[PDB]
Structure formats: structure tokens, C-alpha cells
Amino acid sequence: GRATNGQFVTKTAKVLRYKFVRWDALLIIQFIDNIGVMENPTFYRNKSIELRSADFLSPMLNNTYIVPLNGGVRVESPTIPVQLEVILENNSSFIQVGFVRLTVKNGNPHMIIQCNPVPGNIKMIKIKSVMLFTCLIG
Amino acid sequence: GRATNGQFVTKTAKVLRYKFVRWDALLIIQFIDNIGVMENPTFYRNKSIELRSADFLSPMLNNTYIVPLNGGVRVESPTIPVQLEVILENNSSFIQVGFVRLTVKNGNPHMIIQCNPVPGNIKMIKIKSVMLFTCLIG
Amino acid sequence: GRATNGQFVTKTAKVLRYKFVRWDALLIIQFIDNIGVMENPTFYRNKSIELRSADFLSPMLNNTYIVPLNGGVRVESPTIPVQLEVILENNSSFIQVGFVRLTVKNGNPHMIIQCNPVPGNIKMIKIKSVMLFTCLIG
């Protein structure tokens, strides 16, 4: 088909836009809010999906941050690695390879974000990567 | 099509289950043994594909562990990065970004797992990520 | 369809070959120059896409190396993580998880390669991973 627009909404009413394509048992979905661009002939700017502390569930265990989501599609995706910037309450920040999945719980989609230990409490996680999941349905 | 079940079997008779879809020149395959789940409203549990020392070929060079496989499909996949937990003979363990491919040798599929140096001999590698390969056939 | 051959060419006339498949809004493209192989029953050899200093734009900022490309297809791909070997002018080298995208600027495709800080100036980046992008067109 052609690519259909859609979105998820976070606990704090942040809107995560995506485009998707669904064929037989296949669902391919890309998040489109942070598609980086070259703004001139020589500079590439990354864009962030910015996820705040209030977007995550509590308690968090094992450097696993869970973003309950409302609306959009309901998939058990594979894991994709992303560029993360993990910002602490003290404004210190750590660049990490994160690992992201979409999963379903209580009929709600949730985004699972896993990363490494940091010396403090998290204020914000920024996903600097353009995320696309290829998923198998059923 | 709809997603067809299948599996590979390791040298020690471990069974690695997958689902796949094959269209024109495309083969998309997901391993399904370790699909993590939220077990309650607040806890996500990762599941592991556990690969033992006896599943790998010897000698191993350059932190490259090769798992000869029997049965299933025969593809030259791209490389996917995964979450690994590399467990040493002394029960010490290291969390790593691994890189995985499927390749064919002697008409047998083999899984290529590459990671970083560790201070010791490996007893076990656990893949904590949900793996899906998108492959081009011919 | 079946997989169509194609290529990009770098500023220094290096040829990057790929195969691709284009369906409705989907474009899937794999680079094929560095498909690793088992050369015997026990040894896997990685192959490199080797990108020289002269293939990149200047100035480089924020450990972002941009390879202007000519020919081939024009896509805004998602980000894929790769195995990189970053070789310095002093022949010292660092193994890294890189992050790669294809982007379009001035109607030209460009390959965006992002990695970590290194103690020196870069002579060469080797991509040791088999790269495939799944892309959404429009």
C-alpha cells in the first residue's frame, strides 16, 4: 500500500507520530518526528524524540524505562538499537546505544527502552536515531 | 503470506524457533523463543536465547563465535546488533552490543555472533534481544 | 520483484554496490561489497567497506562524517547501527558501534556516519557490518 499516518500519545500528552505500511503478516512502522536533515551543504543535524521522566512508569528496574502509550497500533516488535542521550537531574548526560521494542500490555502499546547504568536519576531520554520497526503479525 | 513456523537445531540439540515470511526476493525471519513480556503493569522481563560453549565451533578467533545449525532456512542475512550477556567460566558476566548474521557454509546455516574481548573463557552467551532479519534472496 | 543491482559512487570514484527491491511505498536496499563468508569450516572473515578521509565532507562536526554520493537511489532511510573500525592518521584504530543513515541533500544521496570521539584525526572508516536499510517512501 501507500504509507498511512498514525500516532501514539504519552502519559503527558506528548504525541509520537509515525507512518506505517501493513501487508499480509507484515507491519513496518517508522517514527517520523525526528528525521534528521542536512541544513546546509556541510552540516547534518540530528533530531530527538524527547521522553521526559513523567512519560515513564515507576518503579524502574534494571535500566528499563517503560513508556505507556495510547492509541496507534498494537505490536510485539523486534528489538532495535538506537542512539540515546540520557540526561540526569544534574544536567549531566550520557550518550548510549539503547535498545527499543514495542510490546502490548492490557491492550495498550508500550515502548520498552533499555540502556546502561548512569550515576544519578534520569530527567530525560532523547532518542537521536530514526526508528523503524519491521514486525511479524501472528 | 501468513507467518510460517520453523526452527534451527544446534550441535547440542538446542532448538531455536522462528517464524518467517517469504515473498518475491524477500525473506523476513524473527526468532520467537525469547519475546520479552510485561508480566505486570510495571515490570518488563527480558528473555534469553541461551547459547552454550558446546554450541560453538573451535577454535574461536577474533571474538567471533560460530554456531553451526541444522535444518531451517539458508540465508546470507545482513548484520543485526543485539543485547548480549557474555558469561565466563568464573560466572562473571559482561553486557555487550553483539552483532549477528546468518550465513551459509557447506549447505548448512551458521549463526555468526561477534562481540568484544572479555577477561576469560566463555561458558555461555545469552541473546536478550528479539532478533528479526530482513534478507534479500538472489 | 527480484533484486535489482545498483551502485553509488563516492567523491574519489569509489563504487559502493548494492541490491534492492522496491514495492508500493517500501524500498529495501542492501550493500553487497562486504558480505562476510566462512572461508573454511571454522573461520569467518569480515569484509569492510573502506571509506577514506577524502570521501568525507569538511569540516566534520560532532563525530558526524558525511559521504556525498552520486547516482543510485535517493532515500531518507532509518538509522542502522553498524560495526565500525575507525583508523587514525597514526594507524591506531578503534572498534565502535556506528550509526548510519541515507539522506538526500541538493538532490544528492548522502551517507551519514556517526560514531564516538577518537584521540586524533581520521584516515579511514571501515564498515565491517552487512548493511541493509528498510525504507518508507512518501
Side-chain angles (χ1 to χ4, degrees):
Chain A
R2 292 145 163 164
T4 303
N5 290 284
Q7 74 286 313
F8 295 112
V9 180
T10 74
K11 221 194 137 147
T12 66
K14 182 171 169 78
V15 169
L16 310 179
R17 287 155 52 252
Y18 60 81
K19 288 182 167 163
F20 81 89
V21 155
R22 209 221 174 291
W23 273 76
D24 302 12
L26 199 59
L27 172 70
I28 295 170
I29 170 168
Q30 177 179 330
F31 289 72
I32 69 170
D33 285 323
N34 70 329
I35 300 165
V37 291
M38 288 173 68
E39 296 197 353
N40 55 54
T42 190
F43 175 69
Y44 181 80
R45 187 198 289 287
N46 288 257
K47 290 197 205 286
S48 295
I49 299 172
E50 292 165 344
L51 290 163
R52 294 223 137 227
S53 190
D55 299 306
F56 305 123
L57 294 178
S58 203
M60 89 77 186
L61 288 171
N62 250 70
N63 322 105
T64 301
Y65 307 77
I66 303 183
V67 186
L69 296 168
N70 282 125
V73 77
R74 296 185 166 94
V75 291
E76 291 301 320
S77 77
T79 302
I80 73 163
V82 298
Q83 296 156 285
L84 284 190
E85 186 174 0
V86 172
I87 299 153
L88 306 192
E89 268 159 52
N90 73 356
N91 296 325
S92 157
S93 79
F94 300 81
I95 304 282
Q96 294 184 356
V97 187
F99 290 88
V100 185
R101 288 198 64 223
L102 301 175
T103 197
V104 189
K105 185 63 172 188
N106 183 224
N108 290 122
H110 294 253
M111 182 183 291
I112 309 293
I113 305 170
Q114 296 177 298
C115 56
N116 309 311
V118 287
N121 294 304
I122 309 306
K123 185 214 273 293
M124 166 161 17
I125 300 173
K126 294 185 179 221
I127 302 172
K128 306 291 216 48
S129 267
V130 181
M131 298 191 292
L132 169 151
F133 305 77
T134 295
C135 314
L136 284 198
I137 311 306
Chain B
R2 292 145 163 164
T4 303
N5 290 284
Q7 74 286 313
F8 295 112
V9 180
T10 74
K11 221 194 137 147
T12 66
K14 182 171 169 78
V15 169
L16 310 179
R17 287 155 52 252
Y18 60 81
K19 288 182 167 163
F20 81 89
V21 155
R22 209 221 174 291
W23 273 76
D24 302 12
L26 199 59
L27 172 70
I28 295 170
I29 170 168
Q30 177 179 330
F31 289 72
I32 69 170
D33 285 323
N34 70 329
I35 300 165
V37 291
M38 288 173 68
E39 296 197 353
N40 55 54
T42 190
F43 175 69
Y44 181 80
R45 187 198 289 287
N46 288 257
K47 290 197 205 286
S48 295
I49 299 172
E50 292 165 344
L51 290 163
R52 294 223 137 227
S53 190
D55 299 306
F56 305 123
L57 294 178
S58 203
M60 89 77 186
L61 288 171
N62 250 70
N63 322 105
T64 301
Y65 307 77
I66 303 183
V67 186
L69 296 168
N70 282 125
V73 77
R74 296 185 166 94
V75 291
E76 291 301 320
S77 77
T79 302
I80 73 163
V82 298
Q83 296 156 285
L84 284 190
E85 186 174 0
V86 172
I87 299 153
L88 306 192
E89 268 159 52
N90 73 356
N91 296 325
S92 157
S93 79
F94 300 81
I95 304 282
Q96 294 184 356
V97 187
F99 290 88
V100 185
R101 288 198 64 223
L102 301 175
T103 197
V104 189
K105 185 63 172 188
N106 183 224
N108 290 122
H110 294 253
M111 182 183 291
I112 309 293
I113 305 170
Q114 296 177 298
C115 56
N116 309 311
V118 287
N121 294 304
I122 309 306
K123 185 214 273 293
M124 166 161 17
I125 300 173
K126 294 185 179 221
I127 302 172
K128 306 291 216 48
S129 267
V130 181
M131 298 191 292
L132 169 151
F133 305 77
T134 295
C135 314
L136 284 198
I137 311 306
Chain C
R2 292 145 163 164
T4 303
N5 290 284
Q7 74 286 313
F8 295 112
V9 180
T10 74
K11 221 194 137 147
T12 66
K14 182 171 169 78
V15 169
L16 310 179
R17 287 155 52 252
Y18 60 81
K19 288 182 167 163
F20 81 89
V21 155
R22 209 221 174 291
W23 273 76
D24 302 12
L26 199 59
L27 172 70
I28 295 170
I29 170 168
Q30 177 179 330
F31 289 72
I32 69 170
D33 285 323
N34 70 329
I35 300 165
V37 291
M38 288 173 68
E39 296 197 353
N40 55 54
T42 190
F43 175 69
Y44 181 80
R45 187 198 289 287
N46 288 257
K47 290 197 205 286
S48 295
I49 299 172
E50 292 165 344
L51 290 163
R52 294 223 137 227
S53 190
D55 299 306
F56 305 123
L57 294 178
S58 203
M60 89 77 186
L61 288 171
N62 250 70
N63 322 105
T64 301
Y65 307 77
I66 303 183
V67 186
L69 296 168
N70 282 125
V73 77
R74 296 185 166 94
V75 291
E76 291 301 320
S77 77
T79 302
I80 73 163
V82 298
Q83 296 156 285
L84 284 190
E85 186 174 0
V86 172
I87 299 153
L88 306 192
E89 268 159 52
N90 73 356
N91 296 325
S92 157
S93 79
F94 300 81
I95 304 282
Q96 294 184 356
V97 187
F99 290 88
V100 185
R101 288 198 64 223
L102 301 175
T103 197
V104 189
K105 185 63 172 188
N106 183 224
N108 290 122
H110 294 253
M111 182 183 291
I112 309 293
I113 305 170
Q114 296 177 298
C115 56
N116 309 311
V118 287
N121 294 304
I122 309 306
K123 185 214 273 293
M124 166 161 17
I125 300 173
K126 294 185 179 221
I127 302 172
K128 306 291 216 48
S129 267
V130 181
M131 298 191 292
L132 169 151
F133 305 77
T134 295
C135 314
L136 284 198
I137 311 306

mmCIF file of all heavy atoms in Angstrom, chain C residues 59-75:
data_model
loop_
_atom_site.group_PDB
_atom_site.id
_atom_site.type_symbol
_atom_site.label_atom_id
_atom_site.label_comp_id
_atom_site.label_asym_id
_atom_site.label_seq_id
_atom_site.Cartn_x
_atom_site.Cartn_y
_atom_site.Cartn_z
ATOM 1 N N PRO C 59 34.146 21.024 6.941
ATOM 2 C CA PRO C 59 34.564 20.466 8.244
ATOM 3 C C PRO C 59 33.626 19.378 8.792
ATOM 4 O O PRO C 59 32.427 19.385 8.500
ATOM 5 C CB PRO C 59 34.531 21.692 9.169
ATOM 6 C CG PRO C 59 33.456 22.573 8.568
ATOM 7 C CD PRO C 59 33.610 22.396 7.080
ATOM 8 N N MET C 60 34.162 18.450 9.576
ATOM 9 C CA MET C 60 33.316 17.480 10.236
ATOM 10 C C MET C 60 33.042 17.978 11.659
ATOM 11 O O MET C 60 33.945 18.470 12.342
ATOM 12 C CB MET C 60 33.942 16.072 10.195
ATOM 13 C CG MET C 60 34.872 15.729 11.353
ATOM 14 S SD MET C 60 33.938 15.277 13.062
ATOM 15 C CE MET C 60 35.526 15.112 14.219
ATOM 16 N N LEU C 61 31.789 17.869 12.089
ATOM 17 C CA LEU C 61 31.384 18.275 13.440
ATOM 18 C C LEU C 61 30.758 17.137 14.200
ATOM 19 O O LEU C 61 30.093 16.302 13.601
ATOM 20 C CB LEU C 61 30.338 19.385 13.361
ATOM 21 C CG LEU C 61 30.819 20.759 12.920
ATOM 22 C CD1 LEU C 61 29.601 21.651 12.702
ATOM 23 C CD2 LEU C 61 31.785 21.354 13.929
ATOM 24 N N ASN C 62 30.929 17.114 15.518
ATOM 25 C CA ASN C 62 30.154 16.185 16.354
ATOM 26 C C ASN C 62 30.291 14.687 15.976
ATOM 27 O O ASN C 62 29.314 13.930 16.029
ATOM 28 C CB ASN C 62 28.663 16.584 16.344
ATOM 29 C CG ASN C 62 28.190 17.142 17.676
ATOM 30 O OD1 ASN C 62 28.576 18.252 18.091
ATOM 31 N ND2 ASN C 62 27.342 16.369 18.362
ATOM 32 N N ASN C 63 31.498 14.277 15.598
ATOM 33 C CA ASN C 63 31.753 12.916 15.142
ATOM 34 C C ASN C 63 30.667 12.448 14.149
ATOM 35 O O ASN C 63 30.048 11.403 14.306
ATOM 36 C CB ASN C 63 31.904 11.970 16.345
ATOM 37 C CG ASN C 63 32.645 12.624 17.517
ATOM 38 O OD1 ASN C 63 32.030 12.994 18.531
ATOM 39 N ND2 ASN C 63 33.955 12.785 17.374
ATOM 40 N N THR C 64 30.436 13.279 13.145
ATOM 41 C CA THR C 64 29.493 13.011 12.089
ATOM 42 C C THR C 64 30.267 13.138 10.787
ATOM 43 O O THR C 64 30.764 14.218 10.467
ATOM 44 C CB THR C 64 28.342 14.014 12.149
ATOM 45 O OG1 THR C 64 27.706 13.901 13.414
ATOM 46 C CG2 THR C 64 27.326 13.761 11.064
ATOM 47 N N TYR C 65 30.412 12.027 10.063
ATOM 48 C CA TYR C 65 31.125 12.027 8.803
ATOM 49 C C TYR C 65 30.132 11.805 7.700
ATOM 50 O O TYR C 65 29.347 10.842 7.713
ATOM 51 C CB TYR C 65 32.217 10.950 8.804
ATOM 52 C CG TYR C 65 33.112 11.108 10.015
ATOM 53 C CD1 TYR C 65 32.683 10.677 11.283
ATOM 54 C CD2 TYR C 65 34.345 11.745 9.917
ATOM 55 C CE1 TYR C 65 33.474 10.849 12.411
ATOM 56 C CE2 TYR C 65 35.154 11.922 11.055
ATOM 57 C CZ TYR C 65 34.706 11.474 12.288
ATOM 58 O OH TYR C 65 35.477 11.643 13.413
ATOM 59 N N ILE C 66 30.178 12.709 6.734
ATOM 60 C CA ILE C 66 29.227 12.736 5.664
ATOM 61 C C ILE C 66 29.917 12.396 4.366
ATOM 62 O O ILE C 66 30.889 13.063 3.988
ATOM 63 C CB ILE C 66 28.569 14.141 5.578
ATOM 64 C CG1 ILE C 66 27.907 14.481 6.931
ATOM 65 C CG2 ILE C 66 27.600 14.225 4.391
ATOM 66 C CD1 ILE C 66 27.159 15.813 6.964
ATOM 67 N N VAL C 67 29.397 11.364 3.696
ATOM 68 C CA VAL C 67 29.888 10.884 2.428
ATOM 69 C C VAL C 67 28.919 11.285 1.315
ATOM 70 O O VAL C 67 27.894 10.633 1.119
ATOM 71 C CB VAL C 67 30.008 9.347 2.421
ATOM 72 C CG1 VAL C 67 30.658 8.902 1.138
ATOM 73 C CG2 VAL C 67 30.809 8.862 3.616
ATOM 74 N N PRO C 68 29.218 12.382 0.596
ATOM 75 C CA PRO C 68 28.405 12.724 -0.571
ATOM 76 C C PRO C 68 28.509 11.600 -1.577
ATOM 77 O O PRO C 68 29.597 11.037 -1.764
ATOM 78 C CB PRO C 68 29.077 13.985 -1.122
ATOM 79 C CG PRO C 68 30.474 13.933 -0.600
ATOM 80 C CD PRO C 68 30.336 13.318 0.775
ATOM 81 N N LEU C 69 27.373 11.264 -2.180
ATOM 82 C CA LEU C 69 27.281 10.152 -3.120
ATOM 83 C C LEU C 69 26.621 10.589 -4.436
ATOM 84 O O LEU C 69 25.811 11.520 -4.492
ATOM 85 C CB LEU C 69 26.502 8.979 -2.505
ATOM 86 C CG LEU C 69 27.119 8.306 -1.269
ATOM 87 C CD1 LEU C 69 26.105 7.383 -0.621
ATOM 88 C CD2 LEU C 69 28.427 7.543 -1.637
ATOM 89 N N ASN C 70 26.983 9.907 -5.497
ATOM 90 C CA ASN C 70 26.429 10.234 -6.790
ATOM 91 C C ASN C 70 25.777 8.990 -7.358
ATOM 92 O O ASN C 70 26.271 7.874 -7.169
ATOM 93 C CB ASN C 70 27.521 10.804 -7.722
ATOM 94 C CG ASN C 70 27.866 12.288 -7.407
ATOM 95 O OD1 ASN C 70 29.039 12.638 -7.173
ATOM 96 N ND2 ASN C 70 26.841 13.164 -7.403
ATOM 97 N N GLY C 71 24.644 9.180 -8.018
ATOM 98 C CA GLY C 71 23.972 8.077 -8.699
ATOM 99 C C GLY C 71 23.052 7.361 -7.733
ATOM 100 O O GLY C 71 22.666 7.921 -6.715
ATOM 101 N N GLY C 72 22.691 6.130 -8.085
ATOM 102 C CA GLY C 72 21.858 5.286 -7.233
ATOM 103 C C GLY C 72 20.534 5.889 -6.822
ATOM 104 O O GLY C 72 20.037 6.821 -7.458
ATOM 105 N N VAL C 73 19.979 5.378 -5.727
ATOM 106 C CA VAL C 73 18.662 5.799 -5.253
ATOM 107 C C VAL C 73 18.721 6.941 -4.234
ATOM 108 O O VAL C 73 19.777 7.211 -3.656
ATOM 109 C CB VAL C 73 17.860 4.595 -4.756
ATOM 110 C CG1 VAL C 73 18.330 4.138 -3.373
ATOM 111 C CG2 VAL C 73 16.344 4.918 -4.789
ATOM 112 N N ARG C 74 17.599 7.638 -4.059
ATOM 113 C CA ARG C 74 17.506 8.816 -3.198
ATOM 114 C C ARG C 74 16.458 8.583 -2.119
ATOM 115 O O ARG C 74 15.248 8.690 -2.390
ATOM 116 C CB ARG C 74 17.106 10.055 -4.000
ATOM 117 C CG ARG C 74 18.106 10.493 -5.043
ATOM 118 C CD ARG C 74 17.644 11.799 -5.684
ATOM 119 N NE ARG C 74 18.735 12.407 -6.446
ATOM 120 C CZ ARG C 74 18.945 12.237 -7.748
ATOM 121 N NH1 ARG C 74 18.117 11.497 -8.464
ATOM 122 N NH2 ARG C 74 19.984 12.834 -8.329
ATOM 123 N N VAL C 75 16.920 8.245 -0.907
ATOM 124 C CA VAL C 75 16.025 7.884 0.197
ATOM 125 C C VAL C 75 16.382 8.592 1.491
ATOM 126 O O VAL C 75 17.529 8.972 1.694
ATOM 127 C CB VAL C 75 15.983 6.349 0.491
ATOM 128 C CG1 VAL C 75 15.319 5.632 -0.606
ATOM 129 C CG2 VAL C 75 17.378 5.752 0.732
#
